[PDB]
């Protein structure tokens, strides 16, 4: 029969999908906002999928300009909130103009007049003093990155580099999945992204994934939530991990901890005392001790019956070689364990 | 804002609902019952289906 034949056709295709699914590694990325999940996903494209096309990089210019403006306005508004005086009075007029322009120009654009003001502001000592006190307000991680190289970004013929792309941040909703081949296997990595809803209603969807990569921003140890300036970001991240690690749907799941932003952490640890996060901390505020302390705080949240080890890695998600290296280590254990 | 405004709208919905003209349970129930009783006798899942009229027979 025609219908019967068609059904047989569909079935032979379904049979392929099953064979393929059998040889596929599923990786669920989890972690608080700004922990490094989107960046890891961008790295999979750069490392395992031939990076970004010319046009794709060009599409990132608007995002990069948005991020850059957003960063400077944050510092500028903090001048008032923190009561920090400009190094040069003339900067006041620049700030006033920049703020008017901000809600006048099209989103994602960077006029010469704007960049000129931004470069002048960036050079001011008051602005620099405010920038160093980022912990006290909400500032993008890439603020210094883009602002320090603003001239390049606005030079005609400018084409975003992979690092420029990696440093970007775009607001999106919905789950994001990336698929690729590596080590003669298929990989499916997903990040739930902008998911405004209760986790309990969807977390079961991931029962059975090959492994969970939990991202923690080491540098969040002295930051607070944008929406709740009373919630320490690291405490929030710990609650998230506690909830996930001890969840009934992941009793025997392989979990790997990515202690991310080690580069920002390494610099911050020389400025901020870890005790801001852990009052009881009695170690030395060094990259070694402090980072190990944070690692232990997270690992100790694991109350699972199956005591299988939760591997930890100090990472810099924006560093392609670091990620390529860690991911290579990670995948080896997975393949040689699952 | 937010907390107050979500709440201000909460109370704003109640005010509307509080003016609901409710019907008697018994009338509702009786009408519910009569509806079912008029057709349960022909409900395939209540009565079962003679094999010859069952499209899901082998």
């Amino acid at each position: 029969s025609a219908e019967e034949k068609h059904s047989r056709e569909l079935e032979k295709k379904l049979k392929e999908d099953a064979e393929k699914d059998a040889r596929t590694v599923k990786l669920l990325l989890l972690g608080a906002g700004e922990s490094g999940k989107s960046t890891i996903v961008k790295q999979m494209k750069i490392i395992h999928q031939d990076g970004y096309s010319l046009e794709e990089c060009l599409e990132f210019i608007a995002i990069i300009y948005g991020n850059t403006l957003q960063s400077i306005l944050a510092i500028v508004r903090a001048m008032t909130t923190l009561n920090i005086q400009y190094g040069d009075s003339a900067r006041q007029d620049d700030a006033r103009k920049l703020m008017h322009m901000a809600d006048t120009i099209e989103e994602g654009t960077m006029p010469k007049e704007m960049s000129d003001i931004i470069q002048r502001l960036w050079k001011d000592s008051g602005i620099q003093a405010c920038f160093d006190r980022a912990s006290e307000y909400q500032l993008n991680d890439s603020a210094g990155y883009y602002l320090s190289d603003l001239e390049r970004l606005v030079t005609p013929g400018y084409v975003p580099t992979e690092q420029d792309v990696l440093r970007s941040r775009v607001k999106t909703t919905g789950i994001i999945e990336t698929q690729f081949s590596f080590k003669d296997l298929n990989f499916r990595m997903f990040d739930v992204g902008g998911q405004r809803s209760e986790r309990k209603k969807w977390i079961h969807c991931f029962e059975g994934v090959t492994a969970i990569i939990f991202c923690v921003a080491l540098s969040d140890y002295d930051l607070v939530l944008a929406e709740d300036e009373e919630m320490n970001r690291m405490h929030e991240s710990m609650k998230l991990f506690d909830s996930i690690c001890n969840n009934k749907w992941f009793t025997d799941t392989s979990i790997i901890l990515f202690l991310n932003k080690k580069d920002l952490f390494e610099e911050k640890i020389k400025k901020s005392p870890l005790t801001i996060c852990y009052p009881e901390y009695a170690g030395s505020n060094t990259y070694e001790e402090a980072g190990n302390y944070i690692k232990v705080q997270f690992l100790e949240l694991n109350m699972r019956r199956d005591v299988k080890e939760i591997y930890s890695h100090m990472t810099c998600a924006t560093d392609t070689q670091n990620v390529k290296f860690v991911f290579d280590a990670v995948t080896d254990i997975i393949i040689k364990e699952n | 804002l937010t907390e107050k405004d979500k709440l201000k709208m909460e109370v704003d919905q109640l005010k509307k609902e509080v003016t609901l003209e409710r019907m008697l349970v018994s009338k509702c129930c009786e009408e519910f019952r009569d509806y079912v009783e008029e057709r349960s006798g022909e409900d395939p899942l209540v009565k079962g289906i003679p094999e010859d009229k069952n499209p899901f027979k082998e």
Partner: protein, 339 residues
């Protein structure tokens, strides 16, 4: 104070709603139906086991011809089956495999689905065979798509984890109306037979009645202890049933603005995932986390039967328009037709 005085006026208005509710509570359905003969032990047999999905099935919906139905699985496939012959009509590869719902257009011309991608995708069946043409992607929700139902070929209502429901103009992909009010993820919705009203169930443990043309909430129904995961309109459009994580299903009457009956049993302790009335409305069938579908006597609240056959949660179910069969979907990757 402002907040507190608001907390006050709200509660006062609430204790005022119940009293009004009591005022109309002169009797109970079970009293009114006590003189009715029991339906006896309902014994349905598995007539078909639809095998094809590679993973958990999360949703299904019967075609209005009571023969074709579509199922959604996180294997990233939307399959359209001929339940009579068991022949697969289509096996649509979705852009996102994290689907949580699917609908069949009354016309049979389109199907729709969505999930963690927060989008409701429309597919044109009257175009491609096997796979099919994605005709529209309705973007707008900021939380997962939990349910969707076509009113016709150009309109569809959706419920989301972002706590809202919406009406969409398909040809435009625009949201013609947004339904705000629930304070918890909306898990399910059901259209009144005349498609002029609809009800939704949510994690705020309440159900709400909505006017589709006027976009506002007419009534809100409370009673459940936990999240309402399923909801369904009763055939006469004067009532509907809910299924909740609290191990109970409930029957609510619109006109009386309250529940008429609770369906439970001390030995049934898990959550409900779906609900559906049989053609006459005599039976209320529900899917449970414990792997069964329990059949309830809608009028007498008696557990009349059980549909045991799945080896994992029954995630969805549906009764055909002609009332001849019930289909159950399960996390065990199979769908079964019972008669």
């Amino acid at each position: 104070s402002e907040l507190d005085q608001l907390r006050q006026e709200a509660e006062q208005l609430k204790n005022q709603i119940r009293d009004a509710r009591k005022a109309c509570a002169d009797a109970t359905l079970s009293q009114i139906t006590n003189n009715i003969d029991p339906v006896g032990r309902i014994q349905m047999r598995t007539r078909r086991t639809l095998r094809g999905h590679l993973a958990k099935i999360y949703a299904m919906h019967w075609g209005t011809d009571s023969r074709l139905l579509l199922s959604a699985s996180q294997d990233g496939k939307l399959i359209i089956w001929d339940s009579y012959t068991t022949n697969k009509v289509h096996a649509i590869p979705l852009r996102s495999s994290w689907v949580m719902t699917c609908a069949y257009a009354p016309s049979g011309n389109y199907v729709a689905c969505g999930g963690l991608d927060n989008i409701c995708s429309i597919y044109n069946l009257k175009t491609r065979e096997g796979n099919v043409r994605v005709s529209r992607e309705l973007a707008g929700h900021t939380g997962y798509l939990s349910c969707c139902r076509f009113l016709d070929d150009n309109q569809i209502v959706t419920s989301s984890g972002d706590t809202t429901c919406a009406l969409w103009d398909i040809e435009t992909g625009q949201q013609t109306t947004t339904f705000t009010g629930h304070t918890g993820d909306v898990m399910s919705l059901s259209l009144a037979p005349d498609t002029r009203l609809f009800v939704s169930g949510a994690c705020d443990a309440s159900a709400k009645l909505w006017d589709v043309r006027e976009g506002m909430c007419r009534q809100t129904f409370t009673g459940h202890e936990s999240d309402i995961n399923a909801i369904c309109f009763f055939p006469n459009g004067n009532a509907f049933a809910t299924g909740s994580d609290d191990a109970t299903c409930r029957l609510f009457d619109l006109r009386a603005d309250q529940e008429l009956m609770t369906y439970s049993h001390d030995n049934i302790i898990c959550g409900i995932t779906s609900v559906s009335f049989s053609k006459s409305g005599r039976l209320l069938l529900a899917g449970y986390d414990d792997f069964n579908c329990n059949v309830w006597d809608a009028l007498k609240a008696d557990r009349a039967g059980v549909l045991a056959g799945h080896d994992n949660r029954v995630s969805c179910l549906g009764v055909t328009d002609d009332g001849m069969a019930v289909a159950t979907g399960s996390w065990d990757s199979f769908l079964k037709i019972w008669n």
